[PDB]
Amino acid sequence: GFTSKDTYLSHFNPRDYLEKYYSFGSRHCAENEILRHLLKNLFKIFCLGAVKGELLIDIGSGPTIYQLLSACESFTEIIVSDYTDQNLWELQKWLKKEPGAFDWSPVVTYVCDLEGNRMKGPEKEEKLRRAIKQVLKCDVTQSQPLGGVSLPPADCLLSTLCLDAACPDLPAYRTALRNLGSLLKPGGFLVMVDALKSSYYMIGEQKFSSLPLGWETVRDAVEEAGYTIEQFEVISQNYSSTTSNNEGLFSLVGRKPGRSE
Numbered sequence: 598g599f600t601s602k603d604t605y606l607s608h609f610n611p612r613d614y615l616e617k618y619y620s621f622g623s624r625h626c627a628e629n630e631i632l633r634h635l636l637k638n639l640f641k642i643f644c645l646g647a648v649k650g651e652l653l654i655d656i657g658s659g660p661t662i663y664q665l666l667s668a669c670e671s672f673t674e675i676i677v678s679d680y681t682d683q684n685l686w687e688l689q690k691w692l693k694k695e696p697g698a699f700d701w702s703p704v705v706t707y708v709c710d711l712e713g714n715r716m717k718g719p720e721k722e723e724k725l726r727r728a729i730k731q732v733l734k735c736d737v738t739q740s741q742p743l744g745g746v747s748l749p750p751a752d753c754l755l756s757t758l759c760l761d762a763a764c765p766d767l768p769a770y771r772t773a774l775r776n777l778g779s780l781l782k783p784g785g786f787l788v789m790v791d792a793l794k795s796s797y798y799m800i801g802e803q804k805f806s807s808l809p810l811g812w813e814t815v816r817d818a819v820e821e822a823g824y825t826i827e828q829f830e831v832i833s834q835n836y837s838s839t840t841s842n843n844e845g846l847f848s849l850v851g852r853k854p855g856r857s858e
């Protein structure tokens with residue numbers, strides 16, 4: 598049935614994932630086009646609006662940092678987290694500037710271009726490394742997703758391409774949303790990106806399930822979780838044939854309501 602979290606542990610190859618989706622090279626052209634659009638939207642979200650603060654927690658980061666490049670302009674501290682241990686190790690290779698770490702330069706350069714070339718690649722990378730304070734295990738399915746570690750409430754919760762993969766059905770998706778809210782202060786921002794109407798994605802021969810949700814369904818689930826949707830955009834691009842069956846992606850910004858009861 599739907600991919601279990603133990604299948605992630607035993608099947609998810611971080612370096613392979615990065616090469617296939619985030620190399621930003623001459624192949625995987627559909628994946629490149631989506632990446633371009635994601636970077637554009639994340640730039641708008643984090644640089645052009647009021648999504649700023651002290652602490653941002655990224656949920657289901659996997660081995661990627663593309664989703665944090667504009668964010669580090671607006672947040673002093675970033676916590677990254679994922680369920681899959683090997684993803685966390687891959688991330689650490691890059692954070693620690695190790696030989697054989699994934700080459701993020703073409704992505705970094707693109708983001709720097711988007712932001713008006715106020716800094717160069719090396720400076721942007723240093724800024725993000727400094728911003729990333731913790732690399733933690735997380736499980737979105739749990740009432741306490743970070744295992745109940747003592748952390749201040751976040752000003753922003755970010756999650757990219759995670760919830761659809763981690764939730765077998767809409768009731769589970771609703772639960773994951775509730776679980777995430779436990780980490781966010783009232784007035785805080787929820788920034789989410791995910792595939793639309795996708796029931797699977799591939800990493801080579803390895804297949805991983807996805808919950809196919811249309812944009813209206815995502816809207817309704819987020820609103821019913823209490824969030825005022827401040828921004829919502831659809832990315833009309835599709836992943837490569839046989840790589841996924843998605844029809845576009847979305848990005849959104851929600852604000853958690855003030856405390857009442």
Ligand SMILES: Nc1ncnc2c1ncn2[C@@H]1O[C@H](CSCC[C@H](N)C(=O)O)[C@@H](O)[C@H]1O
Pocket residue numbers: 602605609656657658659660661664679680681684735736737738756757758759762763
């Ligand atoms: N129950 C769960 N809790 C937290 N993360 C989970 C999870 N189940 C799967 N994941 C993670 O969801 C990720 C999907 S791949 C997404 C990676 C990255 N955020 C990007 O934008 O490309 C994987 O890293 C996987 O480890």
Ligand SMILES: C[n+]1cccc(C(N)=O)c1
Pocket residue numbers: 618758759761762792795796797798806807808841843
């Ligand atoms: C590229 N990618 C990564 C994670 C999830 C998906 C999807 N839910 O279809 C796609």
